[PDB]
Amino acid sequence: GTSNRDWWPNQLDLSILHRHSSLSDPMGKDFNYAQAFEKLDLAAVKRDLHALMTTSQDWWPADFGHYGGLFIRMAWHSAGTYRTADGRGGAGEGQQRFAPLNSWPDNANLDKARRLLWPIKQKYGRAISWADLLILTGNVALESMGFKTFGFAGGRADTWEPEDVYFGSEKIWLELSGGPNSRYSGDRQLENPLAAVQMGLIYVNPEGPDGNPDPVAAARDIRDTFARMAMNDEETVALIAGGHTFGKTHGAGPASNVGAEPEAAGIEAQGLGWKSAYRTGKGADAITSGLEVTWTTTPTQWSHNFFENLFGYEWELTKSPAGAHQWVAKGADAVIPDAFDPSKKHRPTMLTTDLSLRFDPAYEKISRRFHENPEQFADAFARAWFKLTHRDMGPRARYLGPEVPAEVLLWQDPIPAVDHPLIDAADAAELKAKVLASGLTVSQLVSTAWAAASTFRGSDKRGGANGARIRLAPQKDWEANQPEQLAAVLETLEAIRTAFNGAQRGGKQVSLADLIVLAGCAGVEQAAKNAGHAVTVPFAPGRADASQEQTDVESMAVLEPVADGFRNYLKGKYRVPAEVLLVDKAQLLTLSAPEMTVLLGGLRVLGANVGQSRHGVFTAREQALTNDFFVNLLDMGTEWKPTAADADVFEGRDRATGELKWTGTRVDLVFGSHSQLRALAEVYGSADAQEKFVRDFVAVWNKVMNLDRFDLA
Amino acid sequence: GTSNRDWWPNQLDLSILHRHSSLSDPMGKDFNYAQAFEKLDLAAVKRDLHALMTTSQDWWPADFGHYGGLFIRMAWHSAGTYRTADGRGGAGEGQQRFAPLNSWPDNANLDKARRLLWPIKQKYGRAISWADLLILTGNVALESMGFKTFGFAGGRADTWEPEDVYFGSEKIWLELSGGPNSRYSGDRQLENPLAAVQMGLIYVNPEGPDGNPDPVAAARDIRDTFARMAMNDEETVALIAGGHTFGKTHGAGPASNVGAEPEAAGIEAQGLGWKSAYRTGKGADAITSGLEVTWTTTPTQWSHNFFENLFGYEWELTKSPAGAHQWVAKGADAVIPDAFDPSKKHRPTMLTTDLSLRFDPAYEKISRRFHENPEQFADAFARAWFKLTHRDMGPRARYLGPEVPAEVLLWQDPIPAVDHPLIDAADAAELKAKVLASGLTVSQLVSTAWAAASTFRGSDKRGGANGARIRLAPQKDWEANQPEQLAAVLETLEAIRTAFNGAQRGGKQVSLADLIVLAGCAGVEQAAKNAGHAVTVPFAPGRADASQEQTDVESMAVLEPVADGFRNYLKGKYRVPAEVLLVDKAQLLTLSAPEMTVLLGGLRVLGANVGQSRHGVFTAREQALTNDFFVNLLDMGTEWKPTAADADVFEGRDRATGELKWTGTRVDLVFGSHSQLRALAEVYGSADAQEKFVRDFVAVWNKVMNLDRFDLA
Numbered sequence A, B: 001g002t003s004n005r006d007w008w009p010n011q012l013d014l015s016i017l018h019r020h021s022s023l024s025d026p027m028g029k030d031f032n033y034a035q036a037f038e039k040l041d042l043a044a045v046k047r048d049l050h051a052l053m054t055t056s057q058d059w060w061p062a063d064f065g066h067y068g069g070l071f072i073r074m075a076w077h078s079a080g081t082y083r084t085a086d087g088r089g090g091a092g093e094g095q096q097r098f099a100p101l102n103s104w105p106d107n108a109n110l111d112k113a114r115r116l117l118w119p120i121k122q123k124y125g126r127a128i129s130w131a132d133l134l135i136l137t138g139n140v141a142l143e144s145m146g147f148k149t150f151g152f153a154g155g156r157a158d159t160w161e162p163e164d165v166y167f168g169s170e171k172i173w174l175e176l177s178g179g180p181n182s183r184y185s186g187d188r189q190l191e192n193p194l195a196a197v198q199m200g201l202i203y204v205n206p207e208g209p210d211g212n213p214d215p216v217a218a219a220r221d222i223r224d225t226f227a228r229m230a231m232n233d234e235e236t237v238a239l240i241a242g243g244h245t246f247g248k249t250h251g252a253g254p255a256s257n258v259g260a261e262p263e264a265a266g267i268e269a270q271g272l273g274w275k276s277a278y279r280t281g282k283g284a285d286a287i288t289s290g291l292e293v294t295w296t297t298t299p300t301q302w303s304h305n306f307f308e309n310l311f312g313y314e315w316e317l318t319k320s321p322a323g324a325h326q327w328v329a330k331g332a333d334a335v336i337p338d339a340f341d342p343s344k345k346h347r348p349t350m351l352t353t354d355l356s357l358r359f360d361p362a363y364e365k366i367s368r369r370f371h372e373n374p375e376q377f378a379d380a381f382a383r384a385w386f387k388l389t390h391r392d393m394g395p396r397a398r399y400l401g402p403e404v405p406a407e408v409l410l411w412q413d414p415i416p417a418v419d420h421p422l423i424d425a426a427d428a429a430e431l432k433a434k435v436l437a438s439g440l441t442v443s444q445l446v447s448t449a450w451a452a453a454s455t456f457r458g459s460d461k462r463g464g465a466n467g468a469r470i471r472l473a474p475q476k477d478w479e480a481n482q483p484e485q486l487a488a489v490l491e492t493l494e495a496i497r498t499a500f501n502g503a504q505r506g507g508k509q510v511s512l513a514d515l516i517v518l519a520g521c522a523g524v525e526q527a528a529k530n531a532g533h534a535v536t537v538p539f540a541p542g543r544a545d546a547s548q549e550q551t552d553v554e555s556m557a558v559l560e561p562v563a564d565g566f567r568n569y570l571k572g573k574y575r576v577p578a579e580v581l582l583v584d585k586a587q588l589l590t591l592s593a594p595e596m597t598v599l600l601g602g603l604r605v606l607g608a609n610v611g612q613s614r615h616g617v618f619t620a621r622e623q624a625l626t627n628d629f630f631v632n633l634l635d636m637g638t639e640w641k642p643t644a645a646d647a648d649v650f651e652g653r654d655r656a657t658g659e660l661k662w663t664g665t666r667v668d669l670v671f672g673s674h675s676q677l678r679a680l681a682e683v684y685g686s687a688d689a690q691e692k693f694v695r696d697f698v699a700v701w702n703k704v705m706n707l708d709r710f711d712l713a
């Protein structure tokens, strides 16, 4: 059946904005996962998980009689899809159970792991999500095998369809670099937002870069991809050596024995895949990666044997029984147990990427320190495992249950507790009057609150106006934020704040974070007034102001908007057309297509464009809240053509006279071109739509101002 | 960006069940189109339309100073996508304005027609939908040019994204038959559910079959395609000759001058397409089809000049200026006016498909009668134009406004008015108890109500339990409906109904249509009781019973379920896998994926399967409403394999012992295979889900019972 995608493969896809509708969700519209989890008997779940560890099923027998290693890998792959560039991937939505991740080569036989968990899932039902369960199982595997974890939070609600994520353009699984859709260019530069070296891998190739078994060059890939997953050298060493303290890899015969991945398997396979024709196809005969490595002398117990082995032997390149490059210890005795036959032992072995931890000079120093100070290794791995598994959960206010660590960690972008009375409605009215009397314009107030709030992204729940980080490095310096204008606004707001706070008794005080948002609201109110309309913009206080020391500057860089169509801003020239970037941004903001439409048309007329560009400002009453953008965009009296100087800027001329009326970008004009966007624009550009426009604009404005407000949610 | 569709192109697509979410809809949740339309000043809209007809715009100048022909073609194409096989297409959702239809070759330059209507759309806003306005505009065109229409109903609510429709498997626009994705097989047999001869055409090729200019062979294609749009020979002749009384075709130069269709055009084209490099690119120079024919001496006035010309001349094969086959009148004078140059006239011309109306012997008889009796032609055309434009609107209860024709037409599947008091809640309780006391079983009651209600399809809003047509030909004899069992159930219900109605005073009576549904409700309540759960199933009375004489048996054929996975039924063997047919059925029933899942699992355990097949009946307490289907399907203790006899039937055996536990079809096992459906099955197969399962099953049951209840809308 030929589809619109087939006929017009490069047309914009809006369906990403209408994912996760109430239609596809089996739960009632009022289901609240947090409330269900809070009633879960977490202790009981953990007891059942402990029991499961050594309850081997014949259809996928447990290595060494303990599923712990398999489950640690499962949990680490759940979390390991995360990219700091967009916040997408990670463990937080349980996406390992849907396409494409359920069938990525690097997730081979994790289908078995998840199936082993169905009886527990079934038993506890909606009170524990798959997403939480995959991580909790990892934790319990560690604890069962003697490693004390740093903690655990619940609260990852399940999702019910695949996430729309760009994982790369290759059309061949595991394609090596330099192909027609290469994710690499130049001196091994990985394209943003990707954080893996090949299509269908979690981070790097365990044989080495493009299969070349060089630990030194593999280290480079490890460092780059782990950095793109928010991990530094210490965390990376701790995680790799920590993980590979447990379990084994599987490569007992040739890979050609392994059949279809789960999404390709027959219906009789009932959601499992990679059925293997090699011997028994499982257990002692398992084939997963094609490597056959067991790292330690006690693969089911926490030990310090990983670094003892790494440093205590010299290593020789060899091949697994499937033909994959791996390393064996020169001159070693057979000291490593077999997973199934107590009569068999094996020499120590390592992956190319394990050797990276010794042969990369920077890793070597950390690895040696961990070898010499095993308590440092244990603590670092515990902290890194918690970060790995929680990095996409967002503010600590979302963390649920009795095992949440009290310690506040920098990567959580912490916000101080509020310890004082909040401003009330009378106060908010007084502050808005003061803001409007200061001389700050509608454009300034709306621009600043937009800049503050629109850093949020729902993918990892980072960003937003809480914290007033717009006043700190690096947000205060971002070009999209108009640093000089922003400075002048914040100076004026801080003076208002100081005078208000100085007049209070009790401990009542307003945060700058709140005032920035309230001042935005006043701008929108004033804009509606300018247009002859009474309007009320909702405002909820309770934001607090974070410090610079609570704000990791390098982590914050990934939130910089290098494209924000809502301010008609593009920092540079990208391969991806700007209207595609607009929809991407709308998706991060959690906006539907109607919300995106209404919001952008209003921001244009309120003066939110970077640099006060006239592009898309289709009104003769700037700073008045009207539906002018839509009415003028859709006027057939105007003809549009790209400029000679710049094909991405368009001029709108009177069709009869040739007179220039407007200019616009791709982001502006897509609303008059895309057949679904234009249908939305028509609703807002109709003669009966002014009040609808205002009300819908206020609603979406408020939505954006509240995106990070999990203290209320 | 590589997508799941790329990796696994043959996997089932559920996204067709989650269209039309509240996310994509710009109107509020409470918007009611009928409420808006009923307050429209329809007379004012018509006056504006009338003025438009002769108000030429320079960007698309009106032929003969009158846009009437253009708008008639627009409205005919809006309606002309309709297929009776599945009810998809038609004018009822205004899909002409979205992909792919907005960019089909046969819809070339209707983008201009719709753009001409934006000022009126804009003026009246939400009170008239695009869907309604396209049809109204065609009516006003006809009226303005002296043709009396049969009437008009409003009430087609706008939609906001493209409909999922299979329009064929060709990968090239207009591909001639016999290609690798040919829609023809055998002796020119067009594949169901298609109703056009080439990809991107409305019905047939105006040059002749695959371009061969033979009117006799063209007539075969006309008859076949029009029949597949629910039009018989008289209607077809009336419509083609009626339409081609007006306006002209456009083929003033070569088609290579014409550029990208709208979905492929540049952003600056602002939603229009087919920009032409030929001379002025419009008006006298227009190119649309490539044909250049003007049918009558007064293209802007109703006349009987089409048949005067068709029969008064002999015709010679010639070529348009674009090189298309068309026909000119031998020996004729220049009597046809030019569209722009009042000093030029032209000889009469015809399409190959126009000549079909004279050279096909059956058409010729009707054409001659219309020629000799043009009042008969006008009436037939009026009636057919109404049918064409309303055929997908559903029951007459949906028809809005002051111009609805009072005459009830057989094709409307009419339901008699109710002229008596309805049964109340107590009455319904009495009747449910009487039904259960009769000895009718849960299986009989559920199966019967399912059979009655589940003929509905939301594509054209035909079918459903209203009418009690299950008791009439042909429904009573459909194999899916188990004719002998059905007869015994209906006999028993009719005796209940007789006794109840005989005992009433005051005119109160219950219809059989209502009692069939109420009886099914009693079955579902009893099944819940059998499971240890007391529930009340909602029931709304007010259905009426239609007669055989009010039922077109030939038209009702297309509603026969030849695949109904909800009864594990497949009438024959199809190319399309049965699970794809299940999702198609769910889409026609308007079900989400969760709704489909719940409904199927409950039906299985209630005994709804045709023939009492055990396939999918994964319970040892049949006729109790439990979640056994899901618990048992998802039990990893059971292993599934296709049978030797039939690859589409699977045995489920104990994994340890080999003992046979169950059998199932593809429809059953897809819920344990597809990763999204399995995630749904898990929710309902969880230990906490009994109450949820019952409640959601009752809800979706009631939804299905009420699908055709537009009297309650």
Ligand code: HEM
Pocket (backbone or CB within 6 Å): A063, A068, A069, A070, A071, A072, A073, A076, A203, A204, A205, A206, A222, A239, A240, A242, A243, A244, A246, A247, A248, A249, A250, A251, A287, A288, A289, A290, A291, A353
């Ligand atoms: C450079 C980074 C990494 C690479 C290249 C890598 C590679 C692999 C490979 C190829 C396997 C074998 C899969 C199989 O055949 O069954 C594996 C196993 C495993 N990995 Fe890693 N890994 C990495 C990082 C990590 C991290 C960060 C963790 C956890 C903190 C982890 C924990 C494990 C565990 C526990 C197993 C054993 C699975 C079992 O016993 O079934 N790995 N890894």
Ligand code: HEM
Pocket (backbone or CB within 6 Å): B063, B068, B069, B070, B071, B072, B073, B076, B203, B204, B205, B206, B222, B239, B240, B242, B243, B244, B246, B247, B248, B249, B250, B251, B287, B288, B289, B290, B291, B351, B353
């Ligand atoms: C066998 C069925 C039919 C064939 C093959 C056919 C073919 C065509 C073609 C090729 C055009 C020219 C498009 C262009 O170049 O502008 C056209 C125009 C038109 N058709 Fe038909 N048609 C059919 C049936 C009908 C029906 C059922 C109606 C309405 C009842 C209709 C009304 C019109 C009108 C009014 C025009 C003139 C458009 C104008 O003035 O711009 N057609 N037809």
Ligand code: NA
Pocket (backbone or CB within 6 Å): A087, A088, A089, A090, A092, A392, A459, A460
């Ligand atoms: Na994420």
Ligand code: NA
Pocket (backbone or CB within 6 Å): B087, B088, B089, B090, B092, B392, B458, B459, B460
């Ligand atoms: Na339809």
